[PDB]
Amino acid sequence: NVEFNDRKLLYEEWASYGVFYKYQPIDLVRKYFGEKVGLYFAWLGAYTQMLIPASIVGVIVFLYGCATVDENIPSMEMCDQRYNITMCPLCDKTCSYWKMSSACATARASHLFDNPATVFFSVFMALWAATFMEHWKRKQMRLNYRWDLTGFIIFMIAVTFAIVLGVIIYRISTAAALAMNSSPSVRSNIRVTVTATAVIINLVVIILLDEVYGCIARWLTKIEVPKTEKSFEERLTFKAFLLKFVNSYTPIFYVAFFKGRFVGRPGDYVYIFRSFRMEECAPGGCLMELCIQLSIIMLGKQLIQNNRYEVDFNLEPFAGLTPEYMEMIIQFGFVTLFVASFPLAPLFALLNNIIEIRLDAKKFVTELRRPVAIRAKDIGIWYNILRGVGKLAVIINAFVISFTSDFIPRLVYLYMYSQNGTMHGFVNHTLSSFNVSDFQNGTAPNDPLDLKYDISKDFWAVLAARLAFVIVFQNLVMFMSDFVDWVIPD
C-alpha cells in the first residue's frame, strides 16, 4: 500500500480550495508521515479547530461592532463629528473640508469598537491563548501520550540584532517606495491602497531578507562550534527565530508603538493641526489602528497569494519543517500578540489555515519528495517559545489595548461630572480631539489657551491608567490563566 500511502494522502489531502469536507485524518498522517511531521499537523489541526470559537466571536464583535453603532448610532455621530472638528483650524479658506470625509470613514471602522468590543475579546483571547496553550498541553498529553506508547562569540549575535533592529529605515524606505510607486493625493481609497502596497513591498523583500538570515545564522552557529548536533540546531533556531522575529514583527512593533510615539511637533494649534504631509493626505486621521489592521491582513493572507523513485532526485530536499514551525508561529503571534485593533484576526488566520493545511499537505506529497517517517519526539522547543510568546501576549496586547481604548473610558470621568457614565459618555469622543489629537502631539498644546507647560500633566493621568490597566491586565489574566492551567489536564 505504498502507492495507497500516497493515494490516501493524495485524495483525502487534495482539495486546496477550502476544507477537505470529509474529515481531518491526523492519525493517517501519523500512520504514515511521522511524529515530527504529524505533530506539526496535529498542532495546526488543533490551532485551526480552536480558531473556530475565536473567529465566531470575532464576527460577533464585528456584529456588536456593526449593529450597536448603526442602530443606536452612539459612536458614529460622536466619532464623525469628532473628526468634523479635527480640521477646523486647518480650513481658514485654504483646502477647508477635505480629509474630514476620509476621517469620518476611518472612524466607521476604527471607532466602531473601542471600549467594549476590542477589550472584551482581548481578555477573552489572552485567556483563550492561555487556554489554547493549556488545551494543546493537554493535547500534548493526549497526542504525544498516544505517540509515546507507539514508540515501543555571542556578542556577534547581539551585534547582528542591533543590525537587524537597526534595519527599520528599510521599512521606511518601503513605506517611501509605495509613496512614489503610485503617489496619489486623495482621500477615498488612496491611503487604503498605498499602505496596502507598501506592505506588499515589505513582504516581497522581507522574504528575500528572510533567506539572508539563514545564511547568516548557519555560518554564525558553525563559527561558534557547538559540539552536539542536536543543540546545534537548538542554537540555530533560537538564533534564526530571533532574527526572523525581529525581521517580521518589527514593522508592526514600529507602527503599533514607535511610529506614533517620539514625535511632538512645535508650532501650536494653527501649525499642530495641519503640518502632517502638507494638509492633504491624513491630518484628518492619523489612526494607527488601521495600519495595524491593514498590515496583519496582508501578513495573514499573502502566505497564499505569492505561493520507482528515479524522478525524486530532480527536486528540492526535505526537512523544511523548522521554517514551517516558524511560519505559523509568526502567524500565532499575529493572532494573539496583536488582537486588540481588529478582532477577526482569527478568521483571517482561519480561512488561511484551512488552505494552509492542504497547501502544506500537498507540499508534502506532490513536492518535497521524501516522507522519511522520522518519528522523533518533543515539539516543545517551540512550545517554550510559544509560552514565551504567550507570556509576551499578555504584555504586548496590554500595551496595544491600553493606548487606544483608554483615551475615552477615563474621559468618561472628566467631562461627565454632572450626568452620565455611558449615555452622554459618548460626548467625550469629540472633546478629546478638542483637547488635541490624543497622543504626545495632543495632550501638550493647551498652553496657548491657559498660558507643554502644565497641560501635558493630564497626559500622565492617562499614562497612569495606561500603566494601571496593564498592571491589572497581566496580573488578572495571569491569574485567570492560573485557573485554566489547573482545570483542563485533570
Binding site as annotated, residues for Ca(2+): 134, 307, 324, 327, 356, 360, 485, 490
The answer to whether 289 contacts Ca ion (rule: CB under 5 A) is no
Cα gap 256→342, rounded to integer Å: 13
Alpha carbon of 108 to those of 194, 253, 400, 460: distances in Å?
20, 24, 20, 29
Residue whose C-alpha is closest to residue 315's, from 260, 246, 275, 366: 366
The footprint of Ca ion on residues 84-103 (CB under 5 A) is none
Report the partner that residue 35 touches, choosing among Ca ion, a copy of itself, none (CB closer than 5 to 8 A by kind): none
Report the partner that residue 468 touches, choosing among Ca ion, a copy of itself, none (CB closer than 5 to 8 A by kind): a copy of itself
Alpha carbon of 42 to those of 27, 127, 145, 448: distances in Å?
9, 22, 13, 62
Q: Which of 461, 476, 480, 484 binds a copy of itself (CB under 8 A)?
A: 461
Q: Which of 120, 192, 458, 476 binds a copy of itself (CB under 8 A)?
A: 458
The answer to whether 471 contacts a copy of itself (rule: CB under 8 A) is yes
Q: Can you read off the three cell numbers belonging to residue 400?
A: 496595544
Binding track, positions 377-416, relative to a copy of itself; x by CB under 8 A: --------------x---x---------------------
Report the partner that residue 463 touches, choosing among a copy of itself, Ca ion, none (CB closer than 5 to 8 A by kind): a copy of itself
Backbone breaks in the chain (C–N > 2.5 Å) follow which residues?
Answer: 152, 307, 451
Report the partner that residue 63 touches, choosing among Ca ion, a copy of itself, none (CB closer than 5 to 8 A by kind): none
Count of beta carbons in the 10 Å neighbourhood of residue 30: 21
Q: Whole-number minimum distance, CB 324 to Ca ion, in Å?
A: 5
Give me the helices (H) in 154-302, please. Answer: 155-164, 169-181, 190-224, 229-248, 250-253, 288-301
The answer to whether 13 contacts Ca ion (rule: CB under 5 A) is no
Q: Whole-number minimum distance, CB 250 to a copy of itself, in Å?
A: 20
Cα gap 126→398, rounded to integer Å: 10
Element (H, E) at 3: helix 2-11
Please give the annotated binding residues, written as ranges.
134, 307, 324, 327, 356, 360, 485, 490
The answer to whether 480 contacts a copy of itself (rule: CB under 8 A) is no
Report the partner that residue 457 touches, choosing among Ca ion, a copy of itself, none (CB closer than 5 to 8 A by kind): a copy of itself
Q: Which of 112, 281, 298, 470 binds a copy of itself (CB under 8 A)?
A: 470
Give me the helices (H) in 71-189, please. Answer: 77-83, 100-109, 117-150, 155-164, 169-181
Cα gap 103→286, rounded to integer Å: 9
Alpha carbon of 318 to those of 26, 37, 382: distances in Å?
20, 11, 20
Q: Whole-number minimum distance, CB 464 to a copy of itself, in Å?
A: 5
Binding track, positions 414-453, relative to a copy of itself; x by CB under 8 A: ----------------------------------------
Report the partner that residue 109 touches, choosing among Ca ion, a copy of itself, none (CB closer than 5 to 8 A by kind): none
The footprint of Ca ion on residues 321-350 (CB under 5 A) is 327
Q: Which of 184, 464, 483, 489 binds a copy of itself (CB under 8 A)?
A: 464
Q: Can you read off the three cell numbers belonging to residue 147?
A: 505517540
Q: Whole-number minimum distance, CB 363 to Ca ion, in Å?
A: 7
Residue whose C-alpha is closest to residue 343's, from 94, 63, 97, 8: 63
DSSP 442: T
Residue whose C-alpha is closest to residue 131's, from 398, 488, 474: 488
Q: Which of 351, 467, 476, 480 binds a copy of itself (CB under 8 A)?
A: 467
Q: Which of 182, 188, 189, 475 binds a copy of itself (CB under 8 A)?
A: 475
Report the partner that residue 360 touches, choosing among a copy of itself, Ca ion, none (CB closer than 5 to 8 A by kind): Ca ion
Cα gap 90→284, rounded to integer Å: 10
The answer to whether 360 contacts Ca ion (rule: CB under 5 A) is yes
Task: With contacts defined by CB under 8 A, name the span among 239-247, 318-326, 351-359, 463-471 that binds a copy of itself.
Answer: 463-471
Residues 6+ apart with CB under 8 A from 69: 75, 76, 112
Residue whose C-alpha is closest to residue 273's, from 110, 408, 432, 436: 436
Q: Which residues are at the interface with a copy of itself (CB under 8 A)?
A: 391, 395, 454, 457-458, 460-461, 463-464, 467-468, 470-471, 474-475, 478
Q: Which residues are at the interface with Ca ion (CB under 5 A)?
A: 327, 360
